[PDB]
Amino acid sequence: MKASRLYTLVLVLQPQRVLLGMKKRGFGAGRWNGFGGKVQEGETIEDGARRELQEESGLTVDALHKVGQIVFEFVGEPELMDVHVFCTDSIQGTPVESDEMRPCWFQLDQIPFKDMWPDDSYWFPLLLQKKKFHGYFKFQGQDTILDYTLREVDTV
Amino acid sequence: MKASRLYTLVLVLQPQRVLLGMKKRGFGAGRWNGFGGKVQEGETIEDGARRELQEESGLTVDALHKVGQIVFEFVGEPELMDVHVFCTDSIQGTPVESDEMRPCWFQLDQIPFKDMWPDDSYWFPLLLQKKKFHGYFKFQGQDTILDYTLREVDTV
Ligand SMILES: Nc1nc2c([nH]c(=O)n2[C@H]2C[C@H](O)[C@@H](COP(=O)(O)O)O2)c(=O)[nH]1
Ligand SMILES: Nc1nc2c([nH]c(=O)n2[C@H]2C[C@H](O)[C@@H](COP(=O)(O)O)O2)c(=O)[nH]1
Ligand SMILES: [Mn+2]
Numbered sequence A, B: 001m002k003a004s005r006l007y008t009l010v011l012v013l014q015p016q017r018v019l020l021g022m023k024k025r026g027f028g029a030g031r032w033n034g035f036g037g038k039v040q041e042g043e044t045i046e047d048g049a050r051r052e053l054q055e056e057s058g059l060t061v062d063a064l065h066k067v068g069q070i071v072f073e074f075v076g077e078p079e080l081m082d083v084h085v086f087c088t089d090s091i092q093g094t095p096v097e098s099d100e101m102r103p104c105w106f107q108l109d110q111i112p113f114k115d116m117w118p119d120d121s122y123w124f125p126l127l128l129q130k131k132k133f134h135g136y137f138k139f140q141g142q143d144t145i146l147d148y149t150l151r152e153v154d155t156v
């Protein structure tokens, strides 16, 4: 029994492209990723995801849709990361570079898997198929998966 | 905010009655409650719910569904309890007293609220109406609620 900390992850997925951000600092720096961060006290998970999307990308959205949940365990870290994954296709401003992230659009035949977290290669295809998923990944460091589970679900 | 630990709570709800257990030893001793406990590593939440029901009541479950999620914060404790609440749909066997619980059936107009956790007075009416819910309760000790939120949701 480990304790878990709540995080969000937001993918702006349109019919032919996806918006990712190059992490400029901190956890997972140097990798393309969705936008997100810790959930704060008092806000719902979905509202935390909307807040992190605005802080990191400048984008505001009226609604998000939860598509997945991924639990991350790191060797030597007692706390799990419980990451709630959201999507939207509907935005209405322009992405802005922040201190944390440089946003960039990618065509859906040019997903930069080699420059993303290794677990993304497993669950991102499900997200692109509009399937919902639950995942778990145990990492040694930032590069090496020691154990993982991935399952499609009808409800997250 | 605080990290959380993962728990289940299972209610055997039939059209005419509900099964509760009197806690005999540890946390929440002296109060009627559903059956449940900590979710174990690598175990799905729903599998943890089925396991705890069998251990504490002797009943085996052929079908159950998630009806709610309640987060508990106890003043002075470092972490939250994240409690996933389930109702059974099909059971077999007879309830049996265990070292931790004494099971007893209650008519649905005789819910023993005064001998249950104080938060049950808020969310249990939603469970009885077959409404899905999200709750949060901040406790000072075991008797006093300082703050809470409770909402009906379409999906848990
Ligand atoms: N795609 C992907 N995102 C991750 C992984 N691990 C992980 O913390 N994240 C996300 C969750 C959060 O949005 C973010 C970490 O939060 P910060 O932005 O506060 O560092 O990184 C991962 O393995 N893959
Ligand atoms: N109805 C109700 N159940 C609770 C509350 N707090 C709380 O831990 N529980 C349940 C969750 C767990 O299933 C159980 C405690 O698990 P243990 O058997 O590990 O002590 O008690 C509460 O405030 N109300
Ligand atoms: Mn943040």
Ligand SMILES: [Mn+2]
Residues within 6 Å of the ligand: A036, A037, A052, A055, A056, A100
């Ligand atoms: Mn952030």
Ligand SMILES: [Mn+2]
Residues within 6 Å of the ligand: A035, A036, A037, A052, A056, A100
């Ligand atoms: Mn971030």
Ligand SMILES: [Mn+2]
Residues within 6 Å of the ligand: B036, B037, B038, B052, B056, B100
């Ligand atoms: Mn138990």
Ligand SMILES: [Mn+2]
Residues within 6 Å of the ligand: B036, B037, B038
């Ligand atoms: Mn237990």
Ligand SMILES: [Mn+2]
Residues within 6 Å of the ligand: B035, B036, B037, B056, B100
């Ligand atoms: Mn128990």
